[model samples]
Target: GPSVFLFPPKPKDTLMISRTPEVTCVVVDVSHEDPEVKFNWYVDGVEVHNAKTKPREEQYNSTYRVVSVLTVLHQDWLNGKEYKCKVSNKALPAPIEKTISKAKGQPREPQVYTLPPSRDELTENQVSLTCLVKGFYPSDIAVEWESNGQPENNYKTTPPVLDSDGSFFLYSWLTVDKSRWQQGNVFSCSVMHEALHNHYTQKSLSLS
Candidate 1:
């Protein structure tokens, strides 16, 4: 049997722990870094000297960047321990720190939304459908459309954009023949994401 924790969980961070059957890895990703910034890894208040750093660029933008990954065994983080990554620089204030608990939790799920077509669209010869899913932790997601229980492929999906609150937002659109869809039909949008726990979110609109 395993030991159970009695304390409430601490604040969760994007820099969380990744695990495999054989090893556990602590990942730290920062979009911006100061030139003088140095990283220090710690487990249970003691510093680790074998932490590795890799490069993760900001899309197509070029700059000096580094990602800190600390790989260790499960025993090293057992018994409800705390892992920390400290970032220090001489530029201004104190060292920036991020921590992940032994039982790191999942981030918030996507907030799905839809907008109906406005007036003047009847004359445009096309019916429009759009779905916006926002406020999700990671940007990895997929959005699809359906017309009367059939899969819809002809559409556009915008690239995921970072939200103000450390989340991501995305947009998906579908256009169909307005003449053929005058009335008495259904249009649906479904969003798939990891935070949804293998179940996807769907919203439907009926034309009358």
Candidate 2:
């Protein structure tokens, strides 16, 4: 082993993340390894103190470039949030960044539920939940089945059949907990018409 050392080059930076009621902008650009320098924020790898190495004003003057913005309010935070930036004097090799979890509003159009034709892959174990409900003029309907939120029993319902065009669709089956399903996964069945106000919510989910 042999070693000859001369040091002086460590300062380069870029770490950006954007989000709001509908705000989104994520940019993370740190000049790659120039010679042999690298930098900060590495969970599962180690490296997280002040964590923010900045540089680049006019080729490096020495002040602490730029790295700031940890608003702290986006579903708490999960799905990777690492960062890094260290270079300039040591030559080059310190550029790591992470922050990618887009979960805004969360609901474009999925108020329907149906999952028939499966082999496996939901989690936990035994699972099979099905539900179907169609348009109505006076075709009252309500369905229910929940877990991790509460509400689920025996599982069996049938008594609303009749509507080739009269407008009606109802099919039920509940048996859950297979690693806990989720994807707007809400189950419930109810049909009562005193006149019709609000007792027909056919909502289910198991998106994959």
Candidate 3:
């Protein structure tokens, strides 16, 4: 009798990746109990052979799990390419496939606000302006502060944080001098995201 097999579509480790200035990495991890298995990977229809294979045993079933990493430069990944990982075994008639791509990016718009709603509500000498960039994919983003129609100073920003839905959230803190508020100086927070599609976020202080 012919040998029976179970071929399941492998899910990707991540749907989208945020490419940075340094090299970015993508990985495909697959596991199966079968002993006669082979693996291959591709990028934009071209075969990639530099994948590092890590073989380990699954303690639950004593099966084998293989992890393949595909590393690419930030510039190369930004070229809008597609990637696929494939695996084959003698127990099946065809290869099982998993994929990752830049197309699955699900970036979202950002919301900006301040700690104190009104000028009179200030509890201290300085105010912090927070720009919440949430629900974004491929997390490369920039945030800035401007005061009195010029570049603001004494501000801090945090690295982008990955969220559960493959989105990203970041916070920017701008400390404003209390004296500037009395003078009616204009303060603004601006956010730039790759997924914004030429859109810009610049909001003025709503203190009263």
What TM-score do all the candidates reach, one by one? 0.49, 0.23, 0.49
Residue-level lDDT tens digits of model 2 in 1-208? 1111212111011111233211111222323332222333333355555433333322253222233322222222322233222222333233334433322222121123465426664544657777654444333234555544567776765545556655455666777666545544544443332123332244445536
Q: Write the per-residue lDDT of candidate 1 for residues 15-66, one digit (tens) a residue.
A: 2234231122322233354444466877778888886665544434433344
Q: What clash pairs does model 1 have?
A: none
The true-versus-predicted C-alpha distance at residue 49 of model 2, in Å, is 8.5
Residue 60 lDDT, candidate 1, scale 0-100: 48
Instruction: Go through the candidates in order and give each one's C-alpha lDDT.
Output: 0.62, 0.38, 0.57
Residue-pair clashes, model 1:
0
TM-score sort, best first: 3, 1, 2
Stretches of model 3 off by over 4 angstroms after superposition? 1-79, 82-103, 114-121, 164-166
Measured by lDDT, the strongest candidate is 1
Residue 46's lDDT within candidate 3 is: 89
| Model 1 segments more than 4 A misplaced | 1-106
